[PDB]
Amino acid sequence: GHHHHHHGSTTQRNAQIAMGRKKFNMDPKKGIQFLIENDLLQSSPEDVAQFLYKGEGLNKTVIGDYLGERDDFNIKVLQAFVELHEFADLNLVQALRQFLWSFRLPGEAQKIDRMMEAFASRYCLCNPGVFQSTDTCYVLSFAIIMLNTSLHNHNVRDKPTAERFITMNRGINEGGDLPEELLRNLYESIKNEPFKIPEDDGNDLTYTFFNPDREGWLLKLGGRVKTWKRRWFILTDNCLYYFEYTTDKEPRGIIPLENLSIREVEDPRKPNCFELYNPSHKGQVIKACKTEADGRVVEGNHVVYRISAPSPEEKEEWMKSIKASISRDPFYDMLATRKRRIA
Ligand SMILES: O=P(O)(O)O[C@H]1[C@H](O)[C@@H](OP(=O)(O)O)[C@H](OP(=O)(O)O)[C@@H](OP(=O)(O)O)[C@H]1O
């Protein structure tokens, strides 16, 4: 007696949906074009952003690849993508948890930078007055990511305390300090729960963001006067600093590593030696500054800096660290630059 509906066949539409997804996961530009041509997606940056944000059956690494691109359209998609995230009334860790669920960070430094700039800008708009600049937010985001790696990756031996995390971030708020309890809250959140990463392979940027800076006591040979001195070395931002005491703010000397190279060397008396030298200008004095006993700062007089380590293992470690510093890392450098514009 009762009438019944006419139900339409859904075979072809579901097939197109599935086809579009399959295509996207192999090539995001081509999948998006297929869906648009098949009237399953609208062509605006906002519409593409909603599609990626929902991400139904979409590979999150592929989403990140597409959003990071320099194309005018992709830049617009990215901004609309970040706008679909609500960061209001969330702290920076909580906002990062949310954002990092939606895609997987690409490998290329310029792509990461575009995405994290877009995130930081959005966070600051959602939470005005928390950070004095977008730069502050961006840098702290990477401090949080590095903390996640330090705490949760077993390859990092020395786990930072809350107090280390707080002091590491001194000056980040455009020259001033962020609230102690805010930094503590961020630290505690990460300590309690690592970033949960979708489709995690165990090699995500958030788990492998290591700190390459180093410190330690070594014995160094003098310039004009050939005496060996025990000095506290710090390697950071492609420069080798050395100090009389670990507690000094004023270094005994500063050796920019730009244009230098390092080689293992035999010494008649000291074991485990290496040398900094300028490979392009043989015999040339290395640009450096140091302090004299009278308190003057003067140019260094070294053609080479010969340095003795207490073990072959430590020599190897320092050489590796110094070589890595010289070859540089584009993203480390980009962070360095933002930190300089903060200060
Ligand atoms: O301490 P004495 O025996 O007087 O000898 C000093 C030290 O070796 C200095 O090392 P440090 O600065 O670590 O104390 C060195 O400066 P460098 O740091 O430039 O190697 C001086 O080189 P010259 O200034 O080039 O002579 C050298 O005269």
CA distance 196 to 207: 10
- Ligand 1 nearest-atom number relative to CA 226: 8
Burial class, 38, CB count within 10 angstroms (exposed 0-12 / middle 13-18 / buried 19+):
middle
Q: Which residues line ligand 1 (CB under 6 A)?
A: 220, 222-225, 227, 229, 231, 252-253, 290, 300-301
Among 216, 132, 129, 228, smallest CA distance to 171 is for: 132
Q: Is 258 a catalytic residue?
A: no
Residue among 37, 56, 69, 108 flagged as catalytic: 108
Domain boundary residue, one of 210, 225, 252:
210
Residues 246 and 305 in one domain: yes
Q: Are strands 273-277 and 253-256 parallel, antiparallel or unpaired?
A: unpaired
DSSP H helical ranges for 100-205: 109-126, 134-152, 162-168, 180-192
Residues 118 and 128 in one domain: yes
In a domain? residue 4: no
Tokens of 316: 């190897």
Helix axis angle for 45-54 and 28-37, nearest 10°, is: 110
In a domain? residue 3: no
CATH number of the domain that residue 161 is part of = 1.10.1000.11
Residues 94 and 160 in one domain: yes
> Which residue's C-alpha comes closest to atom 17 of ligand 1?
222
- Ligand 1 nearest-atom number relative to CA 301: 25
The tokens 């090539």 sit on which residue?
Answer: 27
> How many structural domains are present in the chain?
3
Among 270, 186, 266, smallest CA distance to 221 is for: 270
CA distance 206 to 93: 12
Domain boundary residue, one of 64, 86, 108:
86
Question: How many alpha carbons fall within 13 Å on the CB side of residue 45?
Answer: 15
In a domain? residue 198: yes
| Rounded distance from Cα 222 to ligand 1 centre (Å) | 5
CATH number of the domain that residue 331 is part of = 2.30.29.30
Domain range enclosing 64 = 9-86
CA distance 297 to 252: 9
| Rounded distance from Cα 190 to ligand 1 centre (Å) | 45
In a domain? residue 1: no
Listed in sequence order, the residues at least 6 apart from 138 whose beta carbon sits closer than 8 Å to its beta carbon are: 116, 117, 120, 338
Give the 3-state secondary structure of residue 221.
strand
Listed in sequence order, the residues at least 6 apart from 262 whose beta carbon sits closer than 8 Å to its beta carbon are: 274, 275, 276, 277, 319, 322, 323, 326
The tokens 């869906």 sit on which residue?
Answer: 35
Binding site residue list: 220-227, 231, 242, 252, 301
Which of 28-35's residues contact partners 24+ apart within 8 Å by CB, and which partners? Answer: 28/62, 28/63, 28/65, 28/66, 29/66, 32/66
Residues 246 and 336 in one domain: yes
> Which residue's C-alpha comes closest to atom 2 of ligand 1?
227
**Could you please report the per-residue DSSP string of 268-291?**
SS-SSEEEEE-SSSTTPPPP-EEE
Tokens of 285: 């004095």
In a domain? residue 26: yes
> Which residue's C-alpha comes closest to atom 21 of ligand 1?
222
| Rounded distance from Cα 327 to ligand 1 centre (Å) | 28
In a domain? residue 2: no
Residues 112 and 18 in one domain: no
Residues 25 and 62 in one domain: yes
Burial class, 246, CB count within 10 angstroms (exposed 0-12 / middle 13-18 / buried 19+):
exposed
Residues 100 and 54 in one domain: no
In a domain? residue 175: yes
DSSP state of 9: P
CATH number of the domain that residue 63 is part of = 1.10.220.20
Residues 181 and 256 in one domain: no
Listed in sequence order, the residues at least 6 apart from 154 whose beta carbon sits closer than 8 Å to its beta carbon are: none
CA distance 190 to 196: 10
What order of strands is seen across the sheet that includes strand 305-308? 261-265, 273-277, 305-308, 214-221, 228-236, 239-243, 253-256, 289-291, 297-299
- Ligand 1 nearest-atom number relative to CA 252: 12
Residues 177 and 223 in one domain: no
Residues 342 and 215 in one domain: yes
Domain boundary residue, one of 210, 245, 275:
210
Question: How many alpha carbons fall within 13 Å on the CB side of residue 91?
Answer: 15
Specify the experimental method: X-ray
Tokens of 188: 């505690």
In a domain? residue 105: yes
Residues 196 and 291 in one domain: no
Residues 147 and 113 in one domain: yes
CA 317 to chain centre: 22
Q: Are strands 253-256 and 261-265 parallel, antiparallel or unpaired?
A: unpaired
> Which residue's C-alpha comes closest to atom 3 of ligand 1?
227
| Rounded distance from Cα 284 to ligand 1 centre (Å) | 18
